[PDB]
Design a binder for this molecule. Sequence first.
Ligand SMILES: CC(=O)N[C@@H]1[C@@H](O)[C@H](O[C@@H]2O[C@H](CO)[C@@H](O[C@@H]3O[C@H](CO)[C@@H](O)[C@H](O)[C@H]3NC(C)=O)[C@H](O)[C@H]2N)[C@@H](CO)O[C@H]1O
Ligand code: ZN
Length: 403
Amino acid sequence: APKGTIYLTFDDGPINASIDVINVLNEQGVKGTFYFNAWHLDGIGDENEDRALEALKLALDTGHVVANHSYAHMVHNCVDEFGPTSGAECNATGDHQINAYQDPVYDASTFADNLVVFERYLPNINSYPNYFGEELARLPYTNGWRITKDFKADGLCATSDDLKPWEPGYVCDLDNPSNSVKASIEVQNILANKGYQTHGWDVDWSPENWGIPMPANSLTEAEAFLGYVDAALNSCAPTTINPINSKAHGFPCGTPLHADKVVVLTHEFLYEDGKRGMGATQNLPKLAKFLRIAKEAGYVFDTIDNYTPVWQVGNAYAAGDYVTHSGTVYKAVTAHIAQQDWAPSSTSSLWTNADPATNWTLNVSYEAGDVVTYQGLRYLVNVPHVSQADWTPNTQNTLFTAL
Ligand SMILES: CC(=O)N[C@@H]1[C@@H](O)[C@H](O[C@@H]2O[C@H](CO)[C@@H](O[C@@H]3O[C@H](CO)[C@@H](O)[C@H](O)[C@H]3NC(C)=O)[C@H](O)[C@H]2N)[C@@H](CO)O[C@H]1O
Ligand SMILES: [Zn+2]
């Protein structure tokens, strides 16, 4: 038996430093989840990205999961007209989390255009089992969560309308949050309706002190960081974390799917000797040590696509157990042994659809007070039922009422 499961996640690649992080993981057989922005493939990301596409292939060919972090990390929302140099301009002012989300519908279509750009550089990318770019996402700067119908969170302080949190006068206020944070929540609901899950994080391997001249140099030591991981296990880390920017407000603490797991967040550019410090010189052995000793401490590493386990012939499932089957979440209705001829489906009596989306869907267990969207209209659930073809919201005056 294992102590728990760590999910190593790496934001904001593929950059030339993705290559070196991958080789450290590959030396120890650990596989990681990589949330990628494809503008590094167009070389407009203002980093070292000569080998970005080489990095993307190395990740896929050595079995790491690739996931959708949007095309340009919402840098169009920081400049006034997004173009080649926008990545460089926005690094001058450092106004990244300021007005990070504005038009939710445009911002969300940035995840769509991400996929179009990947498939253009790696035209055979859909043939990799590891490519989850259509199904797994993470919002820039936001500790947001869309996991199941009953497992969602939101980062209510992750972005700002005016000031940075280290500037005098920054007041957060979860009761009326920033228009940027409001926009970020709409983006998640849009992605959820497209069939995505989104994962935030339990722990952040990041600078303890971003203000420092070389902020990559202040990365937590591995031994100490194993301490933050042991700290975070079953302790509902996303609400207790610091700063209040990276908090996941509304995290369903105690939820069963999160038990015995820790999602670690890091950035590849923290592992590069360069503009942010001695990243490779100081932190690549940090990461190597963390794998050796976290294994010793009793952990097993995995990738986010298994956080929600895949339905498997031969496993015993209990009522209320969550699985994934074709990138769609289901909750067991009936304890049973899963056999090949009754996998989850839109008509299974053994399973109900539990995707965190909000359009009306077949085989969902609706509670009263739920709202669904159907043929462009919003209906409210008057009576708890499991939906089926005959009960479309626009024909069942009893079950649904139009808003
Ligand atoms: C500690 C704190 O006050 N806030 C934490 C955030 O720092 C952090 O979110 C991360 O912020 C980074 C700084 O903005 C940001 O890096 C930027 O990313 C873009 C895209 O790669 C680059 O163009 C910028 O150069 C880069 N900025 C810098 C200074 O390197 C990260 O993308 C973003 N995730 C989160 C997670 O650590 O936690 C907050 O609490
Ligand atoms: Zn990011």
